[PDB]
Amino acid sequence: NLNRHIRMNFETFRSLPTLKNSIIPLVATSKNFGSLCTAIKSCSFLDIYNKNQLSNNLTGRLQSLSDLELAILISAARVALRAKDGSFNFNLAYAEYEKMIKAINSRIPTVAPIKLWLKKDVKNVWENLVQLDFFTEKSAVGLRDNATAAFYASNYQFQGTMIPFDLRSYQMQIILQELRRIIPKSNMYYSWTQL
Amino acid sequence: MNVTTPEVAFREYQTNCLASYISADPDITPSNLILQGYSGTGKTYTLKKYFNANPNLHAVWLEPVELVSWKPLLQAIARTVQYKLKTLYPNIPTTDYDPLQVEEPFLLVKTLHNIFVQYESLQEKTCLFLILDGFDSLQDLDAALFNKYIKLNELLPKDSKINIKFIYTMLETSFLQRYSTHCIPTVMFPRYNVDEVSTILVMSRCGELMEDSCLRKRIIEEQITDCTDDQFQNVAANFIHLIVQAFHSYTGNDIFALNDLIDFKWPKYVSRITKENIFEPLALYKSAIKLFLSTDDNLSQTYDLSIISKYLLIASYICSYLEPRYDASIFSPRYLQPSLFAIERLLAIFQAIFPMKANIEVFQNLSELHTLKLIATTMNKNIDYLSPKVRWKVNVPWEIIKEISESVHFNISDYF
Amino acid sequence: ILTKEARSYLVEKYKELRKDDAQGFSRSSYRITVRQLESMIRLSEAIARANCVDEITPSFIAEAYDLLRQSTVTYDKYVSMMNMIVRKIAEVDREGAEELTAVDIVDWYLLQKENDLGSLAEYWEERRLAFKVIKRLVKDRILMEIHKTVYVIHP
Ligand SMILES: Nc1ncnc2c1ncn2[C@@H]1O[C@H](COP(=O)(O)OP(=O)(O)OP(=O)(O)O)[C@@H](O)[C@H]1O
């Protein structure tokens, strides 16, 4: 198992200190010689280390979202896909969310004698998704490279920070195809991962 | 060398990783260490929880959240390290260096070197865990900053008995990915699951709410006789589960927002408690229903405006969302941001829609609207309305223009 | 022949269809017109004409409403279970009846479809199929559990 992991390391990246730093926890955590031998033979804890290295990636963040957050993400992705430039805003996202809720309700037959959340409550969901970097502002440079660039950036006032919360332009990081790859099919909103 | 490990729930892997990379011998610890996770992940909690079980580790705590820029961050390191070294080993004769003299990282290295030389008389080599919480949370931040603290202690003389062992905490993933080639030991914090958040809130904020004055009133008011602490615990616990299951799709999985919702709704939920409400929390749910039907995070005829102002704000919306092509035909893109226009258009449309000429009250109402910020301009500082370069746009949504039109009996719904 | 309450229910649904078909800014609709109001009766006539009744029930108005608006477990079986259980809970809650457990909900639903079961072998499959529907509702919080648990409509 250790040889397989070493071969994988060699194939993937050839900076040896990376493998050194990967090995260090295995030696450090060992409590007894028998435990050390069993761990180094099984060599399973490198998989745990590697998955924790991957836990805050796009898939890891996406697996933690809620139902309403996921639905709004899907609706935003649909608008981005339909757009020529991929841009979208809060108004279009909520319009699509309302439209898809209406469609889901309609496909449920009416009985002879699912909530559309209010536009104010959806603001918290939007704020959550903007911070988790699923969205991004239209031309967000993000982290500047040097102190002088940060100075000129903090001196200037971007229009995107002044215009209302409902009309800020965003672009998408996870394209709808990636969502359909990742989103489980058991999800109720999965059927809308297609156009 | 051996370090005991606290049993931090839902952070066991990271507690083991901090049992690693942290020990008494500076020859068994790295020069840099990064713990990463988004807000509300427990990194500040877990790191302090681990340090609070092993006092012999000499830790120095700083927060770039308070320290606005890099100069305070540099100066605080020298100040707190010097004070901590005095607190730990006082008997050695030392001379003070002013932390306000640290204007450059080179000067920080110089001061650290001088202080360690002053402690050279120590018998054993010892660690100094300088801790920075939320490095990327620093507001005056740039990409090149972090390398300066990555590659710092190698400029120190390795003969020194005191070795600095930096620890960083970070929020964003786009910050880490610029420094992956350095192979810095990294410990990751993923967002909690719902089952984890609910149990964390139950374990943390249960007893604090359980004995608040609001219940200290209601227990006596309802003359509860057989009450015990276990009943208090269960009744308080049910509240957190109800709020979580009600507002999980709204808050998400964040502890802070759930705590705030609990804080706001707890007195009102307690108010509904009667003699028959306890020992049947279902009735408690079935009586405080309206608490669980609205978020109640709102801070509180919404606009009461003059008629001239109302028609000016109708005409401005018409200007902002009607294409200029139609001004010669109709009078003779809602989801998009409003387009700009000129005052010449606004005055003409206002004259064409009011049921007025150019008395000063019209311009006064327009300037009042601008001061109210119901209409925006293309500038931020040194407003110069009369300059021809300024352009105007609407800063009011459609839902309010509709009510204004209803209140003035106007039919904007037929112009689009 | 239209029953008197069917007229009351028809005007309700025609308002609902006219509401949905309404454009966002202009009041003019495009698909639903007065002809469609006749169509609802005309379709309801034919639907009722397929069976041995000369009295249009409110149910046959809903069927025409569905067909005109539309313009593991099978999808139809899942939703059919939903509309049956969801209205059952809303009925007893609004009427303030005694609370019922998930098992009682499953037994109630199987009682409603006694004749659709071809054999007692199919009974166990449908009974097993029923709990999956419940868990899906709880999975996305369509029916909130209150701690055996009691199910209440989510906001
Ligand atoms: N395992 C846990 N058990 C109990 N409470 C926890 C646990 N993990 C985190 N918390 C709670 O999380 C709360 C928020 O602190 P936390 O350490 O998560 O902040 P943070 O993510 O470092 O914040 P910031 O980025 O704003 O500095 C604490 O008050 C603590 O009670």
Side-chain angles (χ1 to χ4, degrees), chain A residues 18 21 25 28 52-53 56 61 64 66 68-69 89 91 95 117 121 124-125 128 133 143-147 150 164 167, chain B residues 13 20-21 36 38 141-144 173 175 178 183 185-186 188-190 248-253 295 335 338 395:
Chain A
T18 309
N21 181 216
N52 287 284
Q53 293 296 309
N56 283 346
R61 300 208 304 275
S64 71
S66 66
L68 175 58
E69 276 160 321
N89 70 31
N91 283 322
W117 286 68
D121 295 341
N124 269 268
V125 173
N128 287 358
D133 299 298
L143 178 72
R144 299 289 170 149
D145 301 312
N146 68 66
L167 291 171
Chain B
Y13 162 73
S20 193
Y21 307 112
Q36 194 265 15
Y38 286 98
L141 175 63
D142 61 279
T173 57
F175 205 84
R178 304 194 186 206
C183 311
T186 303
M188 293 281 199
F189 302 113
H248 153 53
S249 53
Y250 160 76
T251 52
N253 46 32
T295 46
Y335 292 100
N395 191 52

Side-chain angles (χ1 to χ4, degrees), chain C:
Chain C
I1 299 160
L2 289 155
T3 317
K4 60 184 292 288
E5 58 268 29
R7 311 194 220 151
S8 172
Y9 187 65
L10 178 66
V11 61
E12 292 280 72
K13 292 283 158 282
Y14 177 68
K15 285 180 300 184
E16 188 164 25
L17 290 184
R18 283 281 274 196
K19 190 191 302 289
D20 283 2
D21 216 62
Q23 287 172 342
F25 304 85
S26 49
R27 285 175 172 247
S28 39
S29 63
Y30 202 86
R31 171 186 51 174
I32 300 295
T33 66
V34 292
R35 301 191 194 220
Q36 310 302 355
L37 162 62
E38 296 193 332
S39 302
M40 288 203 70
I41 314 183
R42 192 155 52 223
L43 290 164
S44 305
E45 286 171 9
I47 295 154
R49 184 177 256 183
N51 326 61
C52 66
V53 285
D54 273 327
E55 308 300 328
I56 300 177
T57 53
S59 46
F60 304 161
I61 308 282
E63 191 82 357
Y65 169 81
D66 294 329
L67 258 68
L68 178 57
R69 191 159 183 244
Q70 294 304 143
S71 58
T72 57
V73 187
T74 49
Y75 179 46
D76 294 336
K77 177 170 286 191
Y78 170 72
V79 166
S80 179
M81 290 221 49
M82 175 212 159
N83 276 345
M84 286 176 71
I85 292 170
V86 169
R87 303 297 179 179
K88 182 58 180 177
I89 282 167
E91 182 177 293
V92 300
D93 180 33
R94 181 268 294 167
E95 295 197 344
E98 295 194 326
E99 297 176 332
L100 296 171
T101 71
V103 176
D104 313 315
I105 286 169
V106 167
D107 214 17
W108 171 79
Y109 168 91
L110 291 171
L111 283 164
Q112 301 324 283
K113 292 191 179 178
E114 174 180 340
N115 295 349
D116 293 31
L117 309 183
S119 170
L120 85 169
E122 175 72 340
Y123 173 90
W124 294 109
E125 294 195 43
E126 187 72 5
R127 180 164 177 151
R128 189 177 180 184
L129 185 151
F131 294 98
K132 300 181 179 181
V133 183
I134 292 184
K135 293 166 192 178
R136 274 290 185 101
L137 305 179
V138 196
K139 183 191 172 181
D140 290 67
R141 290 90 181 167
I142 308 179
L143 303 181
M144 307 314 287
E145 271 195 309
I146 293 173
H147 313 84
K148 292 177 178 178
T149 52
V150 175
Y151 288 85
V152 169
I153 295 177
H154 188 58

Side-chain angles (χ1 to χ4, degrees), chain B residues 142-371:
Chain B
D142 61 279
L145 184 65
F146 182 53
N147 291 348
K148 306 187 184 180
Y149 304 83
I150 299 176
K151 297 190 66 63
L152 193 147
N153 73 358
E154 63 192 291
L155 303 187
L156 294 172
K158 297 184 180 182
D159 298 340
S160 67
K161 296 287 184 177
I162 295 156
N163 300 157
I164 320 183
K165 300 295 178 179
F166 283 68
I167 300 177
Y168 315 100
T169 74
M170 297 197 191
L171 289 163
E172 302 190 351
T173 57
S174 62
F175 205 84
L176 255 62
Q177 286 183 0
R178 304 194 186 206
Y179 313 124
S180 187
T181 57
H182 294 260
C183 311
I184 288 158
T186 303
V187 182
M188 293 281 199
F189 302 113
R191 289 279 284 219
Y192 304 92
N193 192 11
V194 176
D195 295 348
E196 298 167 331
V197 179
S198 55
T199 55
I200 290 162
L201 289 175
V202 169
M203 181 177 178
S204 179
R205 194 184 290 229
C206 180
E208 184 278 343
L209 299 168
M210 184 187 81
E211 292 278 31
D212 190 280
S213 69
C214 303
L215 289 90
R216 296 180 192 222
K217 299 177 179 180
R218 294 297 293 142
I219 301 153
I220 302 173
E221 294 194 322
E222 301 299 307
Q223 304 168 318
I224 307 176
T225 53
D226 304 13
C227 210
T228 69
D229 299 349
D230 304 335
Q231 304 163 20
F232 286 118
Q233 183 173 18
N234 295 336
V235 168
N238 298 328
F239 189 57
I240 290 134
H241 297 326
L242 296 172
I243 277 180
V244 166
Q245 292 182 1
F247 300 102
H248 153 53
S249 53
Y250 160 76
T251 52
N253 46 32
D254 176 24
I255 281 160
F256 299 140
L258 285 169
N259 274 336
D260 296 336
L261 292 177
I262 287 165
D263 284 357
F264 304 150
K265 294 174 192 276
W266 177 239
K268 302 182 187 183
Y269 175 98
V270 163
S271 78
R272 306 303 199 280
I273 295 173
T274 70
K275 286 179 181 178
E276 300 188 325
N277 249 351
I278 287 170
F279 317 120
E280 185 165 3
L282 319 90
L284 273 161
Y285 174 81
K286 292 176 170 182
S287 53
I289 307 174
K290 290 186 179 181
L291 299 174
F292 307 135
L293 302 190
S294 54
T295 46
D296 316 335
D297 278 332
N298 305 324
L299 193 57
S300 280
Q301 294 82 9
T302 61
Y303 288 164
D304 282 331
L305 299 169
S306 83
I307 301 177
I308 287 181
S309 274
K310 284 185 178 186
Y311 274 100
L312 285 167
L313 186 52
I314 292 284
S316 52
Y317 184 100
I318 289 174
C319 289
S320 269
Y321 292 87
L322 187 68
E323 313 177 84
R325 301 182 183 177
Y326 308 118
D327 296 351
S329 182
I330 288 182
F331 306 119
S332 58
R334 172 191 174 190
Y335 292 100
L336 282 65
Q337 68 182 8
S339 69
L340 303 178
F341 62 83
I343 275 179
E344 304 89 276
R345 198 181 184 209
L346 177 57
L347 300 183
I349 294 190
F350 173 82
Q351 181 60 92
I353 65 166
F354 196 103
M356 298 269 107
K357 303 184 295 182
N359 69 63
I360 64 100
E361 305 175 66
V362 180
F363 299 116
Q364 186 165 121
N365 275 248
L366 184 53
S367 65
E368 158 181 62
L369 291 177
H370 182 280
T371 305

Side-chain angles (χ1 to χ4, degrees), chain A residues 13-27:
Chain A
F13 44 61
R14 294 210 273 247
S15 165
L16 177 61
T18 309
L19 174 56
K20 195 179 84 167
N21 181 216
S22 80
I23 297 158
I24 295 169
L26 178 59
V27 184

Side-chain angles (χ1 to χ4, degrees), chain B residues 45-58:
Chain B
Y45 179 76
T46 300
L47 183 53
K48 193 72 171 192
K49 191 62 171 182
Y50 161 75
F51 274 108
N52 286 7
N54 303 281
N56 306 76
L57 305 172
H58 303 322

Side-chain angles (χ1 to χ4, degrees), chain B residues 2 15 24-25 32 52 70 75 85 95 103 131 225 238 262 329:
Chain B
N2 303 68
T15 47
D25 183 355
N32 294 272
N52 286 7
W70 59 267
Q75 297 165 356
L85 293 169
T95 61
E103 292 294 279
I131 304 173
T225 53
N238 298 328
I262 287 165
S329 182

